[PDB]
Design a protein around this ligand. Structure first.
Ligand code: B89
Ligand code: B89
Lengths: 688, 688
């Protein structure tokens, strides 16, 4: 029976599966929508304390297969699921979508056959994924599983005979397994003749049916589970390019489960819940020794968070759900809808306060989100409280997250200026290899941080469909033996490929005290994707092929130095020190934003304190023009980007200055319908 | 003067740039087309010794910018190039294209400003790339360079003054650099007022013009070289997805040069010619010690071939050119043309001879290309002499190359069954880290071999546009700490993504003695890309979620064993050994190709000796049906794959068996024009 005198019903007794989930250290699958209700109520409170929510602000409807295999909504008692995979359609009013947004949640039921994936779970997971893709809606996956289902044909276990070499002495081997005439009958009786493929023989007067293959009557034993897993692996690969995908790992995720985490890309790992290919015991078998003590050694957050497989960790399920909900607050309600604007108290119209200084170490997050000080808050570039960092466990040379600029959500990449101390632990499989410490100097792309940069760019583009700002401040790629060996060329090239593919406005901005040198400029140059990319440089930024020291070593050598002493020391070599300094200054004078403007390689030089104002209206004006470019592209007879943007601009009143971001933005927003009428009349002119 | 009494003119004297190239250990750029003439003549001789070639079998025309910047053909004397980048259009009759195929070669001129990339070289390289892309033609790049051009404004060097803190003692610092009234005049005289940005001041009665920024009059100093490099980086990124791209590294390739090698992907590195980001001296500066002795330590073949950055090494320029020419013999003449069929003496109609054996180590290349023995040649699956292995320096657990099947070119991936001993050398930058040996057991995907597999799939798809066969034989992904830490989940997921993107027929075939277990099946399951993928299993292959040993450990435990002794030992525990064997055999009986067929997860089970015949006609029939599917897709009102293939099949005569590959192929080829007439009549029915 139950725990006896509680004021309200014992949930874990009414539905013992709920208690089974709790014993495995996870939330019961039918209790997840309530976690999402809690997390969404909280985001309302964080946004506007006085807002009054009805219960119909949050709706969760279970999705199941109908009689024709099609997904429909039902309301049923928890634990009625006849398969180990479950889904809900969620309709929720949020700050960014006060009239409602929708997404699907799919989840393993760790209580149903240990949350294993059989062909039915695979087909359902694939239908849910397709259901989301068709509607353009996000797909959240809650991973709590033991991977592919495995089995043998249990009905053949008590039936099979051995054909011994010597009936007297078994120990000397056997020739095959077979069924008797009675075995074949038990199978016919139970309508399971298919379970084996046999070949009739006769030895010593009576019939043997040699087992050539065991098939089994139960679905879900072997290769049919492999097929089902490939199906959902490919389904998820495609989903990532199509809709917002994210996964929360909540008890463990095994095999196909672990790949699904990676294939959906965006992953949050609850502390102590491993992401693994196989368990430690199974691996230890093979290896012949007790090499590993736990699954957490193979797939704990100290592996996957440190890897970049897990974008975030969470202390518990609810924290994980809060993170999902916060991550989606930057993301359009569905594919191709505009990005969700959310103005808060920190409005566009203010200077930027926190400012880095040449001789003084800073955390780049201060420039991004601002900084708390003894004398008050110093505001950064982006809206106060809006910075949501991800991939924070991995390749800490770069910092990536979401933020809002006067309400406009965007992806943000910045450069960590402090040296990173990367601790690689020993693998207990190498009798004694040791812990190794990697030093990663600031403002240098290593293979890991190059990969992270490309990954961020892809993750902003693909489901999030965000504009992006990169606060570019790299002194170059590392060219030393180890990093070259570890394929820095490949990871650096991933960045160019990610930019080519980018579909929303991009701003590259070299910040004050910052620099962009050589290859590190190249990889981010706006001619990579001129349709989307624009570059800016602070008046206190630097750029050129080399730093002054490197430049002097090639083009201001001792000959040229002495010639220059010869030219303005009347006496003319304890002059070297100061004369070197002079050559260094001579080089630095080429590296200024004024030269960048003169050569036409940046859109504008800017002042940091005015950047927030400038970028807000530049972005807002770009979002508006992009929108019109796309409307124009949906006509019948199509053209270049140059032709489209020129024609849209020809619709602006003659007096409007095409260069005035605010003016252009304000006039478009006053005139959307009028521009729409103009588009309608062009379609009625595109049969020819 | 010259070396004096030679029978013919001294080329290196008539054009001293030719000698300059030779001194730098490379072929002179205008002598490369002659290398391609040599290599193409040789491929004719290797193919058919008695074929008689005219000189018009090979044509090389230089491409240059005309007066309006457009590329045209000219004939001029070598060394007339006014920029350091050169290109040729090549028209060549080859065995696969006896009437001619074309491609462009672009190359740095290592003799022109040390082969550095300035804005003019970048714009030209970008025009050549676009010229090739427009025509769909391959783009070959010959890399011999020193990276981006660097400079200072030399005209300001003899003109600038220092504003000392104390005119008597320089050693105590300065305040700025400035020009006199006479400096400003020299600049006005030479029409170079733009070279500096100045601010007029007056100190002690006469005018100082403070240098605020040095611009310089010479193009090619700083950020304009960065812009030009980004342009060509993005141009090359796009080319790889569009046309066949390959690069040969011939003296050195530096900076943007090294990235261009990676971005074009397919790379052949001449021995002793480094691929680097910076030189050892420049790196040694920074580090404060003499850490590196040569560029070859940073970017020699022992780094880049071992990395997979270099797909092949070559002993000299000519060997490199032979490899390019051989690599392109598998590749369509231009984008979207059919793959080039080249039947040789080894015709489709024969059994496969070399056969692996369960207890006996083999080289998988024997199954692919066949094997020379004491008693004669044992033929493999593919045409004798047709196997062209690539990425052979890296991740040797997988083997990738091109081959031909009865004349049909295709990409091939196989599994190296022998343990690989991977030697990672120490980096001389870590005071004493040591050489480390990695053991890579056969038939296991590690991060490196997973990456290599995905890379191969991409490289077959993108410019080569090849069908592919994978001889799938993996026992699983490695799930140990080190490989999990090193992100095996990410690389394994690259494979699924590559397959989703694949545009030509794929065959997956588990060979005899081979197996596909768990995750390793999943990643290659045809439901990943059902439009293109088909799976087959040899009658002597195995597959399931786990190997028998692993399966027994979970589902045939001691309880079940003893129950089974209890069932057929009359006496009923020195029976364990044989009874374990019995359970192992019980598991193995589930893992057979007969179960695969019963569950519907493979197209067919096959016999190895008959595979070449079977796959030849299956592929040939797929190439034909694909062709028709595409013709049908180019009509006005479009539909699913199911609908298209069904309609094409409805055109076959009623008596044709849709399942007979040879019959279907033979009837389509007899009827291309008749099918074309049928397509014409459907267009004249697709206005509605
Ligand atoms: C400016 C392009 C670039 N790399 O782009 C990497 C490409 C990323 Cl797509 C690059 C160079 O070409 C040569 C530069 C140095 C000049 C003087 O000799 C030492 C080398 C260093 C440098 O960083
Ligand atoms: C069959 C899918 C798969 N991985 O696919 C990786 C996914 C690639 Cl895209 C996979 C599993 O799910 C669980 C398997 C074991 C079953 C018993 O407990 C130990 C684990 C091992 C395995 O290999």
């Amino acid at each position: 029976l139950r725990p006896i005198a509680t004021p309200y019903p014992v949930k874990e007794w009414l539905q013992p599966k709920r208690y089974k989930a709790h014993l495995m250290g996870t939330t019961y699958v039918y209790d997840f929508p309530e976690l999402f209700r809690q997390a969404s109520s909280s985001q309302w409170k964080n946004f506007s304390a006085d807002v009054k929510l009805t219960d119909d602000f949050f709706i969760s409807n279970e999705l199941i297969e109908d009689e024709n295999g099609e997904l429909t909504e039902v309301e049923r008692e928890p634990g009625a699921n006849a398969i180990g995979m479950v889904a809900f359609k969620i309709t929720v009013k949020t700050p960014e979508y006060p009239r409602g947004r929708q997404f699907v949640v799919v989840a393993n039921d760790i209580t149903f056959k240990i949350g294993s994936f059989g062909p039915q779970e695979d087909e359902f997971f694939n239908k849910v994924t397709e259901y989301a893709r068709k509607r353009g809606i996000p797909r959240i996956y809650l991973a709590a599983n033991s991977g592919a289902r495995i089995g043998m044909a249990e009905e053949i276990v008590p039936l099979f005979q051995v054909a011994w070499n010597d009936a007297a002495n078994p120990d000397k081997g056997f020739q095959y397994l077979y069924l008797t005439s009675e075995g074949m009958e038990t199978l016919k009786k139970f309508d399971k003749e298919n379970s084996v493929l046999t070949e009739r023989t006769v030895i010593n007067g009576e019939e043997r049916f040699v087992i050539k293959t065991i098939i089994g009557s139960e679905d879900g034993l072997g290769v049919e589970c492999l097929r089902g897993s490939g199906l959902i692996a490919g389904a998820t690969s495609r989903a990532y390019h199509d809709i917002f995908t994210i996964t929360l790992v909540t008890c463990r995720s095994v095999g196909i489960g672990a790949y699904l985490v990676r294939l959906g890309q965006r992953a949050i790992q609850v502390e102590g819940q491993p992401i693994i290919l196989t368990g430690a015991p199974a691996i230890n078998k093979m290896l012949g020794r007790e090499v590993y003590t736990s699954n957490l050694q193979l797939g704990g957050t100290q592996i996957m968070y440190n890897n970049g497989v897990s974008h975030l960790t969470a202390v518990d399920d609810l924290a994980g759900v809060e993170k999902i909900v916060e991550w989606m607050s930057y993301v359009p309600a569905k594919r191709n809808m505009p990005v969700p604007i959310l103005e808060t108290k920190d409005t566009w119209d203010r200077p930027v306060d926190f400012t880095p200084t040449n001789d003084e170490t800073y955390d780049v997050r201060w420039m991004i989100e601002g900084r708390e000080t003894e004398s008050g808050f110093e505001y950064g570039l982006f809206d106060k409280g809006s910075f949501f960092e991800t991939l924070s466990g991995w390749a800490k040379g770069v910092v990536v997250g979401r933020a809002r600029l006067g309400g406009i959500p965007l992806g943000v990449i910045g450069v960590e200026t402090r040296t990173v101390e990367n601790l690689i632990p020993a693998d207990p499989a190498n009798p004694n290899s040791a812990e190794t410490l990697i030093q990663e100097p600031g403002q240098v792309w290593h293979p890991n941080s190059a990969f992270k940069t490309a990954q961020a760019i892809n993750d902003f583009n693909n489901g999030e469909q965000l504009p992006m700002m990169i606060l570019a401040n790299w002194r170059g790629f590392s060219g030393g033996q180890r990093d070259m060996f570890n394929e820095v060329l490949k990871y650096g090239s991933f960045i160019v490929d990610a930019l080519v593919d980018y579909k929303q406005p991009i701003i590259i901005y070299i910040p004050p005290t910052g620099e962009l040198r050589g290859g590190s400029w190249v990889v981010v140059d706006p001619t990579i994707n001129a349709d989307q990319m624009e570059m800016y440089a602070d008046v206190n930024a630097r750029a050129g092929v080399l730093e002054p020291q490197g430049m002097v070593g090639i083009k201001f050598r001792r000959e040229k130095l002495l010639d220059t002493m010869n030219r303005l020391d009347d006496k003319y070599r304890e002059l070297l020190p100061i004369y070197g300094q002079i050559s260094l200054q001579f080089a630095d004078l080429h590296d200024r934003s004024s030269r960048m403007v003169a050569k036409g390689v940046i859109s504008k030089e800017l002042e940091w304190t005015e950047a927030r104002r400038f970028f807000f209206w530049r972005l807002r004006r770009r979002l508006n023009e992009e929108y019109l470019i796309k409307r124009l592209s949906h006509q019948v007879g199509e053209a270049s980007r140059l032709e489209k943007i020129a024609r849209i601009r020809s619709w602006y009143p003659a007096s409007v200055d095409h260069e005035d971001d605010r003016q252009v933005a304000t006039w478009i927003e006053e005139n959307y319908k009028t521009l729409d009428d103009k588009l309608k009349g062009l379609k009625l002119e595109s049969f020819a």
